[PDB]
Ligand binder design. Sequence first.
Ligand SMILES: *[C@@H]1O[C@H](CO)[C@@H](O[C@@H]2O[C@H](CO)[C@@H](O[C@H]3O[C@H](CO)[C@@H](O)[C@H](O)[C@@H]3O)[C@H](O)[C@H]2NC(C)=O)[C@H](O)[C@H]1NC(C)=O
Ligand SMILES: *[C@@H]1O[C@H](CO)[C@@H](O[C@@H]2O[C@H](CO)[C@@H](O[C@H]3O[C@H](CO)[C@@H](O)[C@H](O)[C@@H]3O)[C@H](O)[C@H]2NC(C)=O)[C@H](O)[C@H]1NC(C)=O
Ligand SMILES: *[C@@H]1O[C@H](CO)[C@@H](O[C@@H]2O[C@H](CO)[C@@H](O[C@H]3O[C@H](CO)[C@@H](O)[C@H](O)[C@@H]3O)[C@H](O)[C@H]2NC(C)=O)[C@H](O)[C@H]1NC(C)=O
Ligand SMILES: *[C@@H]1O[C@H](CO[C@@H]2O[C@@H](C)[C@@H](O)[C@@H](O)[C@@H]2O)[C@@H](O[C@@H]2O[C@H](CO)[C@@H](O)[C@H](O)[C@H]2NC(C)=O)[C@H](O)[C@H]1NC(C)=O
Ligand SMILES: *[C@@H]1O[C@H](CO[C@@H]2O[C@@H](C)[C@@H](O)[C@@H](O)[C@@H]2O)[C@@H](O[C@@H]2O[C@H](CO)[C@@H](O)[C@H](O)[C@H]2NC(C)=O)[C@H](O)[C@H]1NC(C)=O
Ligand SMILES: *[C@@H]1O[C@H](CO)[C@@H](O[C@@H]2O[C@H](CO)[C@@H](O)[C@H](O)[C@H]2NC(C)=O)[C@H](O)[C@H]1NC(C)=O
Ligand SMILES: *[C@@H]1O[C@H](CO)[C@@H](O[C@@H]2O[C@H](CO)[C@@H](O)[C@H](O)[C@H]2NC(C)=O)[C@H](O)[C@H]1NC(C)=O
Ligand SMILES: *[C@@H]1O[C@H](CO)[C@@H](O)[C@H](O)[C@H]1NC(C)=O
Ligand SMILES: *[C@@H]1O[C@H](CO)[C@@H](O)[C@H](O)[C@H]1NC(C)=O
Ligand SMILES: *[C@@H]1O[C@H](CO)[C@@H](O)[C@H](O)[C@H]1NC(C)=O
Ligand SMILES: *[C@@H]1O[C@H](CO)[C@@H](O)[C@H](O)[C@H]1NC(C)=O
Lengths: 170, 49, 132, 35, 49
Amino acid sequence: IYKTPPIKDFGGFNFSQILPDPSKPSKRSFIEDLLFNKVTLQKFNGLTVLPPLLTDEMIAQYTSALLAGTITSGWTFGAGAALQIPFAMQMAYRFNGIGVTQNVLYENQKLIANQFNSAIGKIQDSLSSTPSALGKLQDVVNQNAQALNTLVKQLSSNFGAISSVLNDIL
Amino acid sequence: ECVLGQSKRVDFCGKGYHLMSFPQSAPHGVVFLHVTYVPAQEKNFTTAP
Amino acid sequence: ECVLGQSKRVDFCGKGYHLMSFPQSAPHGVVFLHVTYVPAQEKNFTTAPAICHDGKAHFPREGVFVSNGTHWFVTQRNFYEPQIITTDNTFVSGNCDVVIGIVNNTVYDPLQPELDSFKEELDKYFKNHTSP
Amino acid sequence: VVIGIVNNTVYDPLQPELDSFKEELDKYFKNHTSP
Amino acid sequence: QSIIAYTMSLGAENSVAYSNNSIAIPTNFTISVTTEILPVSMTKTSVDC
Ligand SMILES: *[C@@H]1O[C@H](CO)[C@@H](O[C@@H]2O[C@H](CO)[C@@H](O[C@H]3O[C@H](CO)[C@@H](O)[C@H](O)[C@@H]3O)[C@H](O)[C@H]2NC(C)=O)[C@H](O)[C@H]1NC(C)=O
Ligand SMILES: *[C@@H]1O[C@H](CO)[C@@H](O[C@@H]2O[C@H](CO)[C@@H](O[C@H]3O[C@H](CO)[C@@H](O)[C@H](O)[C@@H]3O)[C@H](O)[C@H]2NC(C)=O)[C@H](O)[C@H]1NC(C)=O
Ligand SMILES: *[C@@H]1O[C@H](CO)[C@@H](O[C@@H]2O[C@H](CO)[C@@H](O[C@H]3O[C@H](CO)[C@@H](O)[C@H](O)[C@@H]3O)[C@H](O)[C@H]2NC(C)=O)[C@H](O)[C@H]1NC(C)=O
Ligand SMILES: *[C@@H]1O[C@H](CO[C@@H]2O[C@@H](C)[C@@H](O)[C@@H](O)[C@@H]2O)[C@@H](O[C@@H]2O[C@H](CO)[C@@H](O)[C@H](O)[C@H]2NC(C)=O)[C@H](O)[C@H]1NC(C)=O
Ligand SMILES: *[C@@H]1O[C@H](CO[C@@H]2O[C@@H](C)[C@@H](O)[C@@H](O)[C@@H]2O)[C@@H](O[C@@H]2O[C@H](CO)[C@@H](O)[C@H](O)[C@H]2NC(C)=O)[C@H](O)[C@H]1NC(C)=O
Ligand SMILES: *[C@@H]1O[C@H](CO)[C@@H](O[C@@H]2O[C@H](CO)[C@@H](O)[C@H](O)[C@H]2NC(C)=O)[C@H](O)[C@H]1NC(C)=O
Ligand SMILES: *[C@@H]1O[C@H](CO)[C@@H](O[C@@H]2O[C@H](CO)[C@@H](O)[C@H](O)[C@H]2NC(C)=O)[C@H](O)[C@H]1NC(C)=O
Ligand SMILES: *[C@@H]1O[C@H](CO)[C@@H](O)[C@H](O)[C@H]1NC(C)=O
Ligand SMILES: *[C@@H]1O[C@H](CO)[C@@H](O)[C@H](O)[C@H]1NC(C)=O
Ligand SMILES: *[C@@H]1O[C@H](CO)[C@@H](O)[C@H](O)[C@H]1NC(C)=O
Ligand SMILES: *[C@@H]1O[C@H](CO)[C@@H](O)[C@H](O)[C@H]1NC(C)=O
């Protein structure tokens, strides 16, 4: 589990929305606080819900390591021993994977810097404005609740008996 | 495949030329932020084989 | 894919850089033997984004510039193999007034040593021609 | 054999690397005439 | 020897030292083999009603 250095001199980029915010009681960043607010979510008849093994705070600690490693080390930490490379050369390698020569980045370092930062800001606005952005997750939670709720409703059905109350017929 | 590294499969990790991705936690899910290169305005020319 | 060829999808055929695999049978199943190549012990160095020599920004054709604190060279990305800075290993692109964080080094080209030998060879021939 | 081919001059970077030397050598030969 | 309960450890903590002019280039390597197991079939069975 890697952790980011305190310094944030990442060549004009800021990863503020994705880097964890220490201020919150849980070490969550700006973006995934929006998501946790968007979603909408023991019983009498045996129906119990068991807690997950990984507590919700534990997962957010993993994603920091997956994110801290990829912003300072490249692809090495996934396939070997972690090695450090400055972020300015991290982008240069990616362009070689596109087929464009590496000189273009160092020639226009400001333009890519501004476009990346501006693009990240839009995601926060786009997610937080339209309510249908999270339809896929919202389908899972609603589907589970509906089926389970119908099961309880079934106890009131007569099934062709005289009364749906078990003690009443007895 | 395209968080620990770069993907050459087309459309598999976001439309356009791919650079990297960033994971973010979610309730009962995961959300990806694909940073994809996309060519801008073009210009016509004359070519020879 | 993993067996009949070489794989590029990271962490699909073995954990690490993949070479091949050798399948083996099993009762109601199959078992693979992935052969993975992984780098051993490392060593920290001094790096640069480019080199400017005569006003122009230079860039390695493949790899990265590297220094141990005294001299600059170019090596491959995944194995320390020191090499003298050659233009055949380093193309040129425009001037060096925009590269943020640029550093300084002289640029060598294997063209000069060929010319250096002939230039010195030509010097002695003209000296001989003065005798008559 | 190739279809669609057109004609165009081709630059050779190593040629001026030797043309300049041959130019400078030819100047030396002219210089060598004076003594 | 007895039975104990505790909070699980997310792994061995390890920090990395980022800088803007530092690089690390390996000087050696090892070739390790890792196994992988996958089911491919089950025992077929037929039943007369
Ligand atoms: C960083 O890498 C440099 C490039 O290899 C290296 O410079 C080289 O250092 C070696 C010694 O380690 C020299 O080797 C020669 O040393 C003396 C010098 O007279 C000779 O008598 C020996 O026979 C041997 O040939 C190289 O000459 C030298 N190269 C250059 C271009 O200077 C640095 O020493 C390295 N620095 C560290 C801290 O490792
Ligand atoms: C890498 O080496 C380059 C050449 O040695 C060097 O460029 C030179 O920089 C000096 C000082 O930075 C300039 O000297 C002039 O500097 C200012 C103008 O910027 C004047 O006020 C001074 O009086 C002095 O005349 C040289 O003109 C300049 N040479 C060229 C060809 O540009 C780089 O600065 C070096 N880079 C690094 C990172 O060290
Ligand atoms: C690129 O340069 C080529 C050489 O300079 C040139 O080829 C020349 O083309 C002319 C035009 O046909 C030929 O002239 C002769 O053509 C036929 C044989 O092809 C003869 O029967 C005619 O009487 C006439 O004399 C040249 O012989 C020919 N030269 C060579 C060396 O092939 C190309 O045409 C140029 N490319 C383009 C696109 O024009
Ligand atoms: C590059 O040019 C093409 C068309 O080629 C041109 O055709 C003539 C007009 C003449 O000027 C030729 O010398 C040129 O090579 C453009 O395609 C046209 O696009 C417009 C809309 O932008 C459309 O109305 C036309 O129908 C298109 N042409 C055809 C033949 O369908 C192309 O857009 C030009 N490149 C850019 C970036 O605009
Ligand atoms: C390579 O170096 C880094 C740090 O650079 C060091 O900076 C100076 C102190 C000087 O001694 C340089 O020559 C060094 O290279 C190492 O990161 C440090 O590692 C030690 C344990 O080895 C750790 O205690 C420190 O906290 C680390 N630094 C920071 C800022 O956290 C790195 O380990 C070196 N590479 C290898 C393979 O050991
Ligand atoms: C990194 O970039 C981000 C976004 O481009 C900056 O975030 C805002 O910065 C201003 C200036 O102080 C604050 O008033 C805003 O509150 C910040 N946004 C949010 C959502 O808090 C950030 O300041 C930049 N950091 C640096 C060091 O330049
Ligand atoms: C790279 O590592 C291998 C082992 O992983 C080294 O091989 C060993 O070298 C030592 C020398 O001290 C021998 O005692 C061992 O017997 C060797 N192992 C085997 C399996 O032969 C190798 O020397 C290293 N090479 C470099 C350049 O670091
Ligand atoms: C690296 O960062 C330090 C301070 O964060 C700065 O002084 C130095 O100039 C930076 N390196 C380069 C090459 O800009
Ligand atoms: C000059 O060249 C001739 C052969 O071309 C040789 O015999 C003679 O020794 C040379 N002169 C000197 C001073 O070496
Ligand atoms: C391209 O096509 C046109 C007609 O479609 C034809 O006249 C021309 O010769 C072709 N180009 C070449 C190089 O043959
Ligand atoms: C011409 O040749 C002489 C040697 O005889 C040399 O000293 C001089 O420098 C040469 N001229 C030039 C312009 O180099």
